Amino acid sequence: TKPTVDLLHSSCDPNAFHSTIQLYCFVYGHIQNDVSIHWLMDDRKIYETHAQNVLIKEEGKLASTYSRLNITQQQWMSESTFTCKVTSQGENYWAHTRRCSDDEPRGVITYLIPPSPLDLYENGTPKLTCLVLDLESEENITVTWVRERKKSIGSASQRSTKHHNATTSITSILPVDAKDWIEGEGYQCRVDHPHFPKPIVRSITKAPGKRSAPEVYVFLPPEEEEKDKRTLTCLIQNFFPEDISVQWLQDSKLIPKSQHSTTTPLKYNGSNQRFFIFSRLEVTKALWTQTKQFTCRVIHEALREPRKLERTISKS
C-alpha cells in the first residue's frame, strides 16, 4: 500500500499573537498500527517533537492519522525546509514544506502573461511573457524558463525598457507550442538576481475549470440612430476561461485593434464560472453605408475546431 502523505501547516492568524506555527503531517491509506512519523528541519533531527500521533480513522487494513509539530515563528521566517518522514511497511515516504518565499524580493513585480488565444488557435505561434517590473537596473537579472516534460525548450527573447518613472522592466517572451498548452503544460519564469534571497518563481498553466463555449451575437446600429456615426456591438457571453480574442472585420479585411474596444470580462451568476464581454466598433455613417458587411470573430479554447466563431452583420 502507498500512503498519501500531504503535509499541512497553520499560519498567522491576524487576530492572535500566534507565536507557534502548527506543522501537520497527514497520512491516509497506511496499514493500521504500521506507521512511524518523524520530523526533520533542514535535514537534521528533532527528538524534541513530543509528537502526538492523533489517529483519524480505520478502514479494515487501511488507516489514516496525522502528527503535529509546534514550531516558533522565527523557525518559520527562516524559510527552512521542514519535512516529515513516514515509515510504513518498512518503506519510507517524505513530505516537504517551507515558508512561501517572497514573490516580490526587492519589490520586483513579476507577471507571467499567458498567450493570447489569437496566437494559440489562429496564428499558431503562442508566446508567454515574463514582465519583470520595478527593477533598479537590468544588469545581473537572469530570467530562466522551465517546462514540465522536455529538456528541449524554445529560446526566450529578452528585451529591456527604462520607463518614465526610472524603473527598468525586463520582458522575456518565450515562444511556446500551442499543443502542449492544450495538454496542460506548466511553465515557470524564474527571475534571479545576486541579492535576491530566492528566485522569483512564477508558474502558469492553461487556466483550470469547466470549459464553456461562448455565445456570440451582433447587434445592428439602432434604428433611432441616423447620426454621423454608427455603433456596432458584439455580445460574447457564457464563456470560461477569461482568455478570449475578438476581432472585427470589413469584407473579410481585418480592422486594427485600435478602432474597436472590448469590455473587461465580467463574471456571471455563479458558482460555475462564466464571463461576458462586449466588443464595440464605432464606424462613420459613410463607412457603414458602403454596401458591405462586418464580422465579429471570436477565438476561444472552448470552441470546436478551428476554435473560431464568426458572427456576420450586414444590411443586405
Partner: peptide
C-alpha cells in the same frame, strides 16, 4: 520606505527600493 522614485520637476531620474 520602499520602491522609491525620485523626481525632478515631475520627471523621474532614479528608482531605488
Amino acid at each position: 520606505v520602499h520602491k522609491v522614485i525620485y523626481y525632478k520637476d515631475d520627471i523621474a531620474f532614479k528608482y531605488s527600493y
